[PDB]
Design a protein around this ligand. Structure first.
Ligand code: HEM
Ligand code: HEM
Ligand SMILES: [K+]
Ligand SMILES: [K+]
Lengths: 249, 249
C-alpha cells in the first residue's frame, strides 16, 4: 500500500553517503542499540485513525525528549547532530530512520529496505502512545495494532529488537541486557526469554507477555528455532514501522 | 453544515423535562457560571483536523477532570450526577451541553438553540488544547480558529461568557468576578474590559488581548454599545461551540 515519493539525485547521493558515515560512527561509538531505540520511539507514536505522530523528525524536539518513555534519547539526538549537519539536504525524519536501519545492519542483523522522502513535521504527538513495559498482550495489541496498525507477527518480531542493548535504572528503571551478546543482532532474545530468568539478564513484563499468548507464543518458538525466519519477519516489521504514516499511512 | 440525528420521542421528552429540572436546580444552587464553564471546557477540546475531542461526555472521566485547566470541574460533575441519574436515556454529552444552554438562559442571556443526539465517546482528548489565560490573540486564534474551527467574531462573543462567574485562586490562581453582577448575563464584561482595571474585578491577559487586536477590538466596542448585538452573536457562537464535531464537525 506504499507509494514512495520522488527525491532528487542529490538527495539519493546524500542518503548513500550518510548510510556509510552512520555505519562507521555507530560501530565506533557502540551506540547501535540506542539508535535503534531512537528510531523505534520516533516511529511508534503513529496513530492510524488520526494519522498523527510517527517517524517525522519530532523526537529531536525538547517536548518529545521530555516524555518519560524517551529518557536518555536526548543523548542519541546529541550524538547524531554533528553527523546530521554534514547532510543538510536530508530530513531529520529520514536521518533517524536510516540510523535505525544501520544500527541493525552493523550489529549483524538483516538488511532492512530503506526509502527516502519523509518530511519533518512541526508538532510532536501527545505523550502516552508508546508501550508500557509493565503491561501485557492486550496492551501490546492496543498500541501496535489499534494505534500503529501492525500485525501480531510484527509485534513478536519487533520485540526481538531487544536482542541488542540494555535497560538502565536511571532511564526506565529496569536494568541490564536481554542477551549475553548485546551488540550482536541474533535470535538470542527469544532463546533467553524461553529459558526463564537468568542472573545478569533482563526480561520485562512486556517480553514475558509473549510467552503466554496463544498467537505470540508459536512465533517466539519459531524465532528461537529459526534465526533466518526471525530475520525475514524482523526486516518486514522494521520496514513497516519505519514507514508508518509515510507514503500512505 | 449540520445534519442533526434523529432521536426517539422518548429521548425528546427527556430533553424537555431535563431542561426544566436543570433550570430550577441551577438557579437554586447558584451554579450557572460553573455549569457554563463545564460545557465550554467539554466542547473546547475539539480539533477539526483530526476530528478528536469536543462535547462528547468525556469531561466526567477522572483523567480529563485532572487537567489543570479543569480544576474545580469535578464539583460541577458531582453536582449534576443525581439529576443526570433521573434521565438515564440522555447521553452525558447532551446533558452537559444542555446544562450550559440553561446556565445562560437562567441568568438572563439569549436562548441558545439546542439539538440532541451527541454520543458518549470512550476516550478523553489529550491535555493542553484549552486556551491559556496568560497568552494573547495569536494563541486565541490557534485554539478557537485552527483547532476548533470558530471565527474571530465567535472568539470575542464567547469571551463574553465571562460576564457570569469568577476565577478562584485555588483553581486557576486568578481571583474574582469580571463583573459587578456575576449571576446576570449581560454585556458588562465588555464595558468593564474597556474601562480598565477596577478594584474587586478581574481581567485575564486573554481578555485584555481583545482590546489591542485590530479585528477583536471593533467587536468589543460593538458589544459594549449594543447588548442585543452581543446576545445575537453570543447565541450563534455558543451553539457552534456546543456542536463541535457533532452532526458534522
Ligand atoms: C514491545 C514493546 C516495547 C516495550 C514495552 C519496550 C520497552 C523498553 C524499555 C523499558 C527499555 C529500557 C530503556 C532504558 O532503561 O534504557 C527499552 C530499551 C530498548 N528498546 Fe524497547 N520496548 C518495546 C519495543 C521495542 C521495539 C519495537 C524496538 C525496536 C525494534 C525496541 C528497541 C529497543 C532497544 C534497542 C533498547 C536498548 C536501548 C539501549 O541499549 O540503550 N524496543 N525498551
Ligand atoms: C477565551 C479563552 C478563555 C480563557 C483563557 C478562559 C480562562 C478562564 C479561567 C482562567 C477561569 C477561572 C477558573 C477558576 O479559577 O475558577 C475561567 C472561568 C470561567 N470561564 Fe473561561 N476562559 C476562556 C473562555 C471561556 C468561554 C468560551 C466560556 C463560555 C462561553 C467561558 C466561561 C467561563 C465561566 C462562566 C467561568 C467562571 C466559572 C466560575 O464562576 O466558577 N470561558 N475561564
Ligand atoms: K544478542
Ligand atoms: K454580568
Amino acid at each position: 500500500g506504499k507509494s514512495y515519493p520522488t527525491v532528487s539525485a542529490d538527495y539519493q547521493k546524500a542518503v548513500e553517503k550518510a548510510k556509510k558515515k552512520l555505519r562507521g560512527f555507530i560501530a565506533e561509538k557502540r551506540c547501535a542499540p540506542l539508535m535503534l531505540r531512537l528510531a523505534a520511539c520516533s516511529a511508534g507514536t503513529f496513530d492510524k485513525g488520526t494519522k498523527t505522530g510517527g517517524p517525522f523528525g519530532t523526537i529531536k524536539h525538547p517536548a518529545e525528549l521530555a516524555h518519560s518513555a524517551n529518557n536518555g534519547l536526548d543523548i542519541a539526538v546529541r550524538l547524531l547532530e554533528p553527523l546530521k549537519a554534514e547532510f543538510p539536504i536530508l530530513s531529520y525524519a529520514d536521518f533517524y530512520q536510516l540510523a535505525g536501519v544501520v544500527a541493525v545492519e552493523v550489529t549483524g542483523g538483516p538488511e532492512v529496505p530503506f526509502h527516502p522522502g519523509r518530511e519533518d513535521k512541526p508538532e510532536p504527538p501527545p505523550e502516552g502512545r508508546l508501550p508500557d513495559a509493565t503491561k501485557g498482550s492486550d496492551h501490546l495489541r492496543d498500541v501496535f495494532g489499534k494505534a500503529m496498525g501492525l500485525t501480531d507477527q510484527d509485534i513478536v518480531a519487533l520485540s526481538g529488537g531487544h536482542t541488542i542493548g540494555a535497560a538502565h535504572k536511571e532511564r526506565s528503571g529496569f536494568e541490564g541486557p536481554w542477551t549475553s551478546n548485546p551488540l550482536i543482532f541474533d535470535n538470542s532474545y527469544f532463546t533467553e526469554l524461553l529459558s526463564g530468568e537468568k542472573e545478569g539478564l533482563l526480561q520485562l513484563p512486556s517480553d514475558k507477555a509473549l510467552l503466554s499468548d496463544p498467537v505470540f507464543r508459536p512465533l517466539v518458538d519459531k524465532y528461537a528455532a529459526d534465526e533466518d525466519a526471525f530475520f525475514a519477519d524482523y526486516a518486514e516489521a522494521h520496514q513497516k514501522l519505519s514507514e508508518l504514516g509515510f507514503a500512505d499511512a
